[PDB]
Amino acid sequence: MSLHQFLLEPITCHAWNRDRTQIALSPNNHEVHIYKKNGGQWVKAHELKEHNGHITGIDWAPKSDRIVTCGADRNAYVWSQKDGVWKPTLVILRINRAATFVKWSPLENKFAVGSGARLISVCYFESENDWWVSKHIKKPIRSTVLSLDWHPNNVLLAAGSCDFKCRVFSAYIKEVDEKPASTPWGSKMPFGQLMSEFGGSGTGGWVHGVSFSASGSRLAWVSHDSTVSVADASKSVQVSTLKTEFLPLLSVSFVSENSVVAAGHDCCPMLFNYDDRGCLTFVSKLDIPKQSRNTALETLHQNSITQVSIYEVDKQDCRKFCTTGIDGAMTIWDFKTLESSIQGLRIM
């Protein structure tokens, strides 16, 4: 619950390093800032400025410390650390509309960029003439791609877009990857192949956030209908949906095998349970109000949360997770503190 007012401005995205000592936020402009924790204070560190547009996606790899940035100026940069200073390297995208989201691969050889030109760019590294080569996944995508996530076997990719559907592609480059094994999602996996296309027919909303699991056999996505849904591939590829009574949610992540944490326009993270038989049940809001004209909403965030990321090791075991908001903050929540404080809250 440790707030830190970094700014008085919105933060688009943020990323952490391996030691959890540096952060990389963007103060809603054409610059990227890095902060360093020392003592009990956060001091501004080396600043990055190459975009003439507006940075929308920032990702930091855990190993080799390379930072990828993409923005609204249809361009992508890879920043590498040398002798105290960060230097950029250009990535050609062959894109003509925008770039909206970016994520590294788990084995740090490719990275995926969503775009507003109805395609997904998978970029890999060519050291024969030392640049980055992009490949495109186009069909069938009929709208703007909003969210991506990588499966933990360096092959499959999950994409949610504005055509009210969530779909799983197979991004596989023969030069930089080995032969994949069989998955419960599918068996034949060439490049650009669709594995499944979940989505609500008839009624539907824009998919804001997708997430895989630690085992890689369960997928979850949220929508603009204030609905959260979990698809299981092992149980004959089925889907379980849940309609909430709150405002729509923007970011989501599996925090375990059978628990999911979400956040959004309600300013408060919430917890949902998914049993093995298959039932999505609302459990509790994590930010309980304290037992204690200014409006003064009884919530630690004063505006909409746009990102939820894990803070303690990985998806296999979680004890802390982090949130960033439009009011400008960085809140670290603790599971062992929230276990004793809220009666009846049983995290699995």
């Binding site: 069989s182 068996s187 034949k188 996996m189 060439p190």
Partner: peptide
């Protein structure tokens, strides 16, 4: 090419 993609039998398996």
């Amino acid at each position: 090419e993609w039998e398996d």
